[PDB]
């Protein structure tokens, strides 16, 4: 039905726009990345900042807290997926484009994408591209890993989303329902379906196009897409100064998430689904419900 | 829990240290074509650490990417200004400069960021128009009717007026035109002064003085 929720804890303390953020296996700990170049690890429940590490490069387009929690990946505009050690460890090089997103398959390997159409899979202790993914034609903007790390899809600027398998390294099928840049991707928690945010002011859901969301008043595209714990809801950040809540199954708007002084950058969701944090360009990380 | 409390207190200690060093530093974006000698203006990221009058400036050059630049450009909205560099000598790509500047001006996020316009090859433009091998009116018939060595100045002000008209066709962010070359070492002062003006206007908006 209709869902409303308000800010619970404001994780103030960042100096620049919170451009990307990520949660660990334990939802209590979160990693927040901002363009100021400072990866602060926040304790969600107590608002404590457990760790506050600095960064080699100020621009950080993605941050990956490993499921084991030992290391953090700081992928930015620099062509390096820097990995820091807790309780700097490696300098991965070889990508020819900006690190749009990074995701940890397990402790010792990382899967990344570049501004160039190439996506790569690394091994951390050796820093070598075990697998290469080079089927796209536009810039890859985001990734999405299923509960099983075997498959991942890479939304590109050419209005095409190609699903990849880590072992084979070759694309098997392509979706081109959208008509503009796809800057947000997130697998639906169940099955192979996944959502795609686009600059055409329209969000669509794809599975092996079958759904679309657009109103006349909405003239701004999507900026981040994520689901709930069960996937019934679809929280999609928007370019306009407030977030918007959609329904995966229904075309109508479930509700709105206003309270941000700028655009939403990343709309992270805790793995357990007990909280939602929407990093915005207002240098604040408001946690809702 | 006291250990967590004291660790946190230390954390915001170095965080306020970082906050004051961060506010002490200003970020910049350097843009231009390959033939545009933006590296001369400077003299993953071609990071630059330069300071004037005891304030730290960080001018970031993005040369490690490909032609598609409409997505990573959004990461630079927080910068005080964008150093836009145009190599106006090759009139074939000058229309590209106009289109790129027009895209920057009308972008959803960049309507708040003032842009510093640098015309980079004014010596080369002067030599080219003196030679007259390629006619400016051929690349733009509007120069056959536009009115203000007189000819080099006329061409320079026409090419700047194209960008200025594109900018003014749509307050808020402003566009500062400038003429630069390789031999000019004062570009840092121009950037610093224009960033000072931009920050002053941001303060006027912020302090309810408007």
């Amino acid at each position, epitope marked *: 039905g209709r869902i409303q929720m308000r800010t619970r804890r404001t994780l103030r303390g960042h100096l620049a726009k919170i451009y990307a953020m990520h949660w660990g296996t334990d939802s209590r700990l979160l990693v927040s990345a901002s363009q100021d170049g400072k990866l602060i690890i926040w304790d969600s429940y107590t608002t404590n900042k457990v760790h506050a590490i600095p960064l080699r490069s100020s621009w950080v387009m993605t941050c990956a807290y490993a499921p084991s929690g030992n290391y953090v990946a700081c992928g930015g505009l620099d062509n390096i997926c820097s990995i820091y050690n807790l309780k700097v460890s490696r300098e991965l090089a070889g990508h020819t484009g900006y690190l749009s997103c990074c995701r940890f398959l397990d402790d010792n390997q990382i899967v990344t994408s570049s501004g160039d159409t190439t996506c790569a899979l690394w091994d951390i202790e050796t820093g070598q591209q075990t697998t290469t993914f080079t089927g796209h034609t536009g810039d890859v903007m985001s990734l999405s890993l299923a509960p099983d790390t075997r498959l991942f899809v890479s939304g590109a600027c050419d209005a095409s989303a190609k699903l990849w398998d880590v072992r084979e390294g070759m694309c098997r099928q392509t979706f081109t329902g959208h008509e503009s840049d796809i800057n947000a991707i997130c697998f639906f928690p169940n099955g192979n379906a996944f959502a795609t945010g686009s*600059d055409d002011a329209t969000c669509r859901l794809f599975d092996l196009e079958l759904m679309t969301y657009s109103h006349d008043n909405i003239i701004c595209g999507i900026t981040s897409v994520s689901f709930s714990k069960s996937g019934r809801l679809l929280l999609a950040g928007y370019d306009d100064f407030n977030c918007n809540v959609w329904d995966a199954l229904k075309a109508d708007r479930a509700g709105v998430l206003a309270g941000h002084d700028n655009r939403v950058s990343c709309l992270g969701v805790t793995d357990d689904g007990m909280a939602v944090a929407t990093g915005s360009w207002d240098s604040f990380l408001k946690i809702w419900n | 829990e006291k250990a967590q409390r004291e660790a946190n207190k230390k954390i915001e200690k170095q965080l306020q240290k970082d906050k004051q060093v961060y506010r002490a530093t200003h970020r910049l974006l350097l843009l231009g074509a390959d033939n545009s000698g933006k590296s001369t203006i400077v003299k993953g990221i071609f990071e630059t650490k330069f300071q004037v009058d005891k304030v730290n400036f960080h001018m970031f050059d993005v040369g490690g990417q490909r032609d598609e630049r409409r997505k990573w450009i959004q990461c630079f909205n927080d910068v005080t200004a964008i150093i836009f560099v145009v190599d106006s000598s090759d009139y*074939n790509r000058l229309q*590209e400069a106009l289109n790129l500047f027009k*895209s920057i001006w009308n972008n959803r996020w960049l309507r708040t960021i003032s842009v510093i316009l640098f015309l980079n090859k004014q010596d080369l433009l002067a030599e080219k128009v003196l030679a007259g091998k390629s006619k400016i009116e051929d690349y733009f018939p509007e120069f056959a009717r536009y009115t203000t060595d007189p000819r080099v100045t006329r061409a320079k002000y026409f090419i700047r007026d194209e960008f200025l008209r594109i900018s003014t066709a749509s307050g808020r962010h402003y566009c500062y035109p400038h003429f630069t070359c390789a031999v000019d070492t004062e570009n840092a002062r121009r950037i610093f002064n224009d960033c000072r003006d931009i920050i002053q206007r941001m303060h006027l908006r912020q302090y309810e003085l408007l």
Partner: nanobody
Amino acid sequence: QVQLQESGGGLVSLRLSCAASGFTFSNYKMNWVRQGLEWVSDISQSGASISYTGSVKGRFTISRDNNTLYLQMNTAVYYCARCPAPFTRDCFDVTSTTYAYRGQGTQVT
């Protein structure tokens, strides 16, 4: 699946017609590119605010019809290009290489 077709080409005036489908033609603006891969001219959303490349202002003429775009020859490949912005007049990567939202081209001489 976004896809574009064009009609025309051949020895020389010619009707450079763009066949577009799969997306709302009204929302996005259009551009013309010659091959360099240089931009030529554009038509705003309402068919006004027309701007031309200087070496095109006199010789050539453009128009828009509501899913088709028309240009009239008074010498290279002419892809039919559009912009990714649906409701705003910024447009970045038409001149870019391997840009998807572009035509297949007609050879005119």
